[PDB]
Amino acid sequence: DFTTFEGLSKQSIPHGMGVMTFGTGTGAGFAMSQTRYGDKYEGEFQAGYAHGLGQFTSEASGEVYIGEFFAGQRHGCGMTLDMKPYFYLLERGVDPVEAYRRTAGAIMKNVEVRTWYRG
């Protein structure tokens, strides 16, 4: 399904640290509806699950999550950003400096800090 994984592995299962890019479908214990084509998870893996500390990035939607994961779901402290306007301006031919200058304040104001329990 073009889902790719690069990182440490025990036996044949992802184990340790690594980066996983999602294609069609899902992986690393994530729900089928959470991911899209091109999203990535970087951080700790354990028994094929995104378990530990990590960061989830979605280029299509702009959501960025940094923090704790248990099993395959968010569980612990986390920080959420919505960089959608920056990507929107970047994809429309605007140089990164100008897009950052335009959309830094709104993104900084909407930074969220949260505690998650079983997703």
């Binding site: 280029e59 990507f87 031919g93 990164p96 400096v97």
Partner: protein, 49 residues
């Protein structure tokens, strides 16, 4: 045998052009602006001496 005899193997392709994608089509998630003045899209003019 027809390909071997007709000299049609001289039309084989071995080379392709390389085109650099712009920042719009690149990994925009990797591009980040530092201090509001620089970014990570590195492009230097090959070798200048």
């Amino acid at each position: 045998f027809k390909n071997f005899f007709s000299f049609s193997f001289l039309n084989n392709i071995w080379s392709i052009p390389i085109i650099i994608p712009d920042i719009a089509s690149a990994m925009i998630s990797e591009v980040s602006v530092l201090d509001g003045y620089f970014h990570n899209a590195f492009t230097f003019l090959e070798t200048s001496v």
